[PDB]
Amino acid sequence: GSSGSSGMVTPSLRLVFVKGPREGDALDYKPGSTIRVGRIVRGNEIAIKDAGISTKHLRIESDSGNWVIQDLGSSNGTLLNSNALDPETSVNLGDGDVIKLGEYTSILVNFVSGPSSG
């Protein structure tokens, strides 16, 4: 069964589409949930039809109690705020991190901690 409360220290990953074809969209996921961002929905948490994005562009994952991004050697390269990510390198996501992938697709990283305010 198991039915309690439990206190999470990992903030939810909220990908806000600041730019791209989805510009104006936003998603939310739980901590420890890999978010494979690609072009085709097929086997992917998020799919963007910006062309610049490939089926298996990159994948998003967490590390224990943090968020990290990894560029699956995409055909172009991923940008973070103002730095090109690497395939053989993993960076830790933050609060207000802009992910510029594809051609003109930007994703904002927002850490949602707690129930929707209101």
Swiss-Prot record:
Domain annotation FHA: ranges: 35-85
Organism domain of life: Eukaryota
Coiled coil residues, start to end: none
Protein name (database record): FHA domain-containing protein At4g14490
Organism: Arabidopsis thaliana (Mouse-ear cress)
